[PDB]
Structure formats: structure tokens, C-alpha cells
Amino acid sequence: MTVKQTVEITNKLGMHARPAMKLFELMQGFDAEVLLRNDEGTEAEANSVIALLMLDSAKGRQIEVEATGPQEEEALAAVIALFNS
């Protein structure tokens, strides 16, 4: 059913890497295509660390999370708890 949400960072959308990178390494756990973007117009497909570096400038912005696959919720929901920190 796809899942997508806009997580307002407090100053760390996991952008850093470890957590945002877990999506990917964890994606191997959740079958889902989690998409990370900033309402700013910055778009990052959970897997393009380069793209994640983009939202790094986040710090206050808001991210739009979108996952799609069997476990897109657990995945997007796992980041969220992370995006939500």
C-alpha cells in the first residue's frame, strides 16, 4: 500500500549515515523501496548515500519519506523513529 511520510528534523534525520544507511543494509531485511527527500526539493532514494548527503543540509528542514515493498512500513517506520530520533 506504499508508505510515505514527512518527518520534520530536529537537526538529525539520521542524514548522517549509519541510520539512514541502515535503511539500505536493513532493506536487506525489509523488502521496500524507501525514498528520502526534503520538501525543499531534495530527493534521495534510500540507497544513494550521495543523495542523503544532499539532505544533510537538512538541519531544520522537513523530509518526505516514502517506502514501497512488503516491509516498507517497518523500513520507513524504522527510519522515522530515527528521523524522529
Side-chain angles (χ1 to χ4, degrees):
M1 56 181 93
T2 352
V3 280
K4 52 253 88 132
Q5 320 183 184
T6 327
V7 211
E8 312 76 44
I9 356 280
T10 178
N11 271 19
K12 34 171 188 205
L13 98 103
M15 72 305 177
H16 169 37
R18 157 61 66 164
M21 290 189 67
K22 105 187 231 313
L23 268 77
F24 328 161
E25 286 284 277
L26 192 269
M27 254 209 288
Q28 93 196 128
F30 299 147
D31 171 3
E33 229 185 73
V34 210
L35 137 60
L36 277 50
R37 59 197 322 164
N38 291 325
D39 179 33
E40 279 291 321
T42 287
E43 329 186 19
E45 281 181 36
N47 156 287
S48 292
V49 214
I50 237 303
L52 278 91
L53 211 184
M54 208 70 161
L55 21 152
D56 191 334
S57 296
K59 79 212 196 168
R61 306 287 86 163
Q62 66 206 152
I63 194 88
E64 229 293 52
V65 56
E66 170 162 58
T68 303
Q71 286 129 260
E72 37 140 11
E73 298 230 340
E74 327 199 14
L76 145 164
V79 345
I80 285 250
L82 229 301
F83 282 19
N84 226 316
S85 183

